[PDB]
Enzyme design. Structure first.
Site, PDB file in Angstrom:
ATOM      1  CG  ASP A  55       2.287  88.373  48.578  1.00  0.00           C
ATOM      2  OD1 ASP A  55       2.826  89.481  48.340  1.00  0.00           O
ATOM      3  OD2 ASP A  55       2.083  87.527  47.671  1.00  0.00           O
ATOM      4  CD  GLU A 102       8.676  84.317  44.719  1.00  0.00           C
ATOM      5  OE1 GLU A 102       8.409  83.134  44.394  1.00  0.00           O
ATOM      6  OE2 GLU A 102       7.782  85.189  44.911  1.00  0.00           O
ATOM      7  N   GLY A 148       3.895  94.050  48.967  1.00  0.00           N
ATOM      8  CA  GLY A 148       4.831  93.171  48.281  1.00  0.00           C
ATOM      9  C   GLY A 148       5.311  92.003  49.124  1.00  0.00           C
TER      10      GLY A 148
END
Ligand SMILES: [Cl-]
Lengths: 413, 413, 413
Positions: A158, A386, A156
């Site tokens: 990356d 994000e 998760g």
């Protein structure tokens, strides 16, 4: 106000039965995202929270129990009841951190409708169990208690700097050109680089060539890592799955073995000289000596002793000497620190939340409160993004990002 | 003075080989009472301390290893040697918290007569082992590591508010009238209510109808609870039984499994949102969200990490903001708090002792000292009573109550 | 300066492939000494550090996996390449604390030459595993998780007051006279007494008569002790062996069982009344109620909870109220305290190091720093000696003692 705006984000990103992590950028259902997002839905509608996870399993879970990191749902009109009411999506071939059992336990214990809670938990329990079973069967062939990831996507996280050396061994010769689409939505400076994606795709092509066969994937993957984040989340999820099993009167003997062997494994990742938990590179056979925010996640698992938790508390305080906003995704003094680039420095709301939870559980109330306050301050000033620059607080990555909204709602419940 | 008066109580309540918990009110031998009482006898006569537990096993233990909560000894004259020297009692069909191995380990390690210690421990060890084995075989069919109680009496905390919802499912239709006898000795306001006893007896009649068969009792009991108190005490007792096994050179492999699986189970009872350990209702499949003094007992087991112990220390301090005397049997802010009624608020000396022991083991010396000081103050002012009002300190329940006297003696040794 | 002088000691005591603990006094290779010494060699030459342990296994390890405490290498000229280049030593029949896997993990993870690290670790791993397997097969027949020592020499703490009562049962009738040689190098007042050696030799003769057979040694040895030091070191070594197994991609399932059962066993040695860890006498079937420095070693294993670690921290502080230099080998208030006599009071550098490591791991930084500072002060003022008077700081025992030099180098790296 914060909660009102958060609900708007979740409703905008809802596709009925699942929530996209962000419009355009992530136009499908993601595994660990859906788990965090379900916590947000508890502040709107309990049925909707359950539905998020029913959808993930019903349309995602493969015949061998594997839960994939993406379910590629086809686009639907945002109207109900449509023609399908009056009158089998593809998935990815890799997984993601298995936070779902922890969320299911919470939904089960706290849903005010007890009949619904029992119905949903009984339905999901054997599916969760099959997923956990797949993880050990496919990814722990040496019976270590630790599961291996074969792709950095499965963390998760990356482009975590932890994966740089392991990824350097992935061949890129004769890789055909491909067309990036993430750059339509997010500035390239905030995303993994070309060299990262080249290696992400090389791994995908290898797995595809092997027809996604677990035995050959384990033997042939040039990327084999024991991720501290994935494993801390799995240990926590095993503990919570055990509790569900007992409450539902199912035999948890299998789960008990995962828990006990996992506790041994997760604590092995602690490096005394560094005073931190490291992921391990099993190709090189070495700890990866890079301190990332994932190394705090054993607190969420509940495996360390207090002394060890206190050394992590000191480290978090150290990171706070250099960054205004906790918790950066990598040590702000690391030579790999990039305050805008994805998992190489930016603050993430889901990790702030899990780490605050862990610190609270160990009695570090001030630190937990700081992680909450920073997360909420970031979202108040910059909206639901994000990730965030830890030095300036500036929003980065996806806009209208679902788990940020979800956890704003959950944290302020 | 306190110790002199305590010895008088024990000698008055002695029937030679066992001690009644209180004259008239409890005119037989009780399981967990005898275990605490034996600690008191160490201050008078070591042989007498052992005899308490020999008697419990010799006359109580059933052929399948079950140790019952009451051995219904027939009344004897308080004279020795009587006609039986010059010239098989009934028991109950339920159990009680298995504190006995912990007491046996202490007697074994500390008896100044080492030959006697070895003789008594070798005699009791296989009996203890058979009792623990029965508990898992009869009460943990799903191999969870947690044992189930089928009657609130088995908690030793008969009318704890934790049991209210589980007990509400026990049928009382067509229950014949019966004749209470506890009310000869204790004011009804300090005892379980009629509605409690109706359900206590309904369960008894069900078990009796089933000829006390474990399989059918587990399947048919409308009361099935994982009691945090029972299980914390069992985990502690397993740890102590292990030590006895090693010291006596017996194979403890079986006990090791109970310990490891029990550690997983007991820690599962922790509720992070409440910051407390809850018992679980397995009929409803839900945690029982009531904070009782039993929820501190995992400290005595030694399972939590320090952070978790610190959260319990905070909670004990909170209860002390509202009650003069620690430790009330239920949170004094609970809507179920009744400062005079048995296990719904009053202070109990045995629980003060176990919880002080646990807090000491976790480094919380001030809190342990407070629990001791309050227990001793209560007994100095009000004598040796079954329980005490936490607000006023007034004595309640049984008069001349044995484990209060016993633990006064043990705590001040 | 300290480091320069330490290197001189190691080079003087080197015999090429192994290091004598001290010239004359200990003219062979010892098991736990070589492990500590290898850490010192990392400050000089990494290959040399590995060679120390290769030599120990290659020339010491028996066919059943047993690693003996002494390899009786024949004297060689300190010249290379000698006639054997241009052109099977005996061993002891007992073992010593198995610190070697912990050292091997460190060499493996930190060697700058990764190809060499992998080659050496792959070579040693099955040898370490065979040694650990031997320990449980020969010395834990009841599957307890704790290993038994049959000779006080196997503790490495030859005349610890803990062994006085167990040793009193060893027969000395008809023991032939023998000729002590340690007294050529060290004053008898600093060494075990005649009565100690008589019993050391009696045990040796028994084992020799039994042809060193494990089954008969276990049944017939009049000395059978669960040593807290040996077992804490073994638990730590098991944890480190597990990590090596995972990193090298070997199946650690066997090791996991040792770890889990060992954690149960080691924590059983804690005595709550004394607030300390005791060794156990399995002949008497009793804890040995003597507080020695070995009782701090569970910190190095990482088994206690923080509360328990805090009680040990208090005890270390108590010892520091009576001795200028921490950590004396026995409680300075013990009636058995002898500030010059070997393991009955003197300060030892290897134990200061392991206990400082443990305290650091539990967050007790001030105490760890004190143990380091005292160790370094002693070596600065008195040179590299086997042990030191805790009251005066005076050097005692062996001169030019290798692990003191080695750990001076390692601690100041
Ligand atoms: Cl802890």
């Amino acid at each position: 106000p914060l909660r009102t705006k958060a609900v708007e984000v979740l409703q905008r990103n809802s596709r009925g039965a699942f929530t996209v992590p962000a419009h355009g950028l992530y136009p499908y259902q993601w595994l660990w995202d859906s788990a965090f997002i379900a916590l947000g839905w508890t502040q709107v509608d309990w049925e909707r929270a359950w539905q998020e996870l029913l959808c993930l399993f019903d349309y995602g879970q493969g015949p061998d129990g594997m839960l994939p990191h993406i379910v590629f749902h086809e686009q639907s009109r945002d109207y109900f009841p449509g023609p399908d009411v009056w009158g089998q999506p593809a998935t990815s071939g890799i997984t993601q951190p298995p936070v779902v059992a922890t969320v299911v336990r919470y939904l089960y214990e706290k849903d005010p409708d007890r009949d619904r809670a029992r119905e949903r938990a009984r339905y999901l329990f054997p599916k969760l169990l099959a997923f956990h079973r797949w993880l050990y069967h496919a990814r722990d062939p040496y019976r270590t208690g630790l599961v291996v990831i074969v792709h950095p996507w499965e963390s998760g996280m990356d482009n975590s700097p932890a994966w740089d050396k392991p990824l350097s061994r992935v061949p890129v010769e004769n890789l055909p050109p491909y067309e990036r689409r993430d750059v339509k939505h997010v500035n390239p400076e905030e995303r993994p680089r070309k060299e990262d994606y080249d290696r992400y795709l090389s791994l995908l092509y290898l797995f595809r060539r092997l027809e996604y066969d677990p035995r050959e994937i384990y033997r042939q993957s040039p990327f084999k890592v024991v991720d501290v984040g994935f494993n801390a989340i799995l240990q926590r999820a095993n503990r919570d799955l055990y509790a569900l099993a007992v409450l539902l009167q199912e035999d948890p003997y299998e789960i008990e073995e995962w828990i006990v062997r996992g506790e041994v494994g997760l604590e092995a990742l602690w490096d005394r000289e560094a005073g931190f938990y490291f992921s391990w590179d099993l190709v090189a056979g070495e700890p990866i000596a890079v301190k990332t925010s994932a190394g705090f996640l054993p607190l969420f698992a509940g495996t360390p002793h207090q002394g060890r938790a206190s050394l992590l508390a000191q480290e978090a305080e150290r990171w706070g000497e250099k960054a205004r906003y906790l918790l950066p995704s990598v040590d702000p003094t690391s030579p790999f620190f990039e305050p805008g680039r994805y998992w190489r420095g930016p603050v993430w709301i889901n990790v702030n939340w899990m780490v605050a939870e862990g610190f609270r559980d160990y009695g570090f109330a001030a630190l937990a409160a700081r992680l909450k306050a920073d997360a909420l301050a970031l979202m108040e000033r910059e909206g639901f993004r994000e990730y965030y620059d830890p030095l300036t607080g500036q929003g980065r990555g996806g806009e209208g990002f679902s788990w940020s909204a979800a956890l704003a709602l959950f944290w302020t419940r």
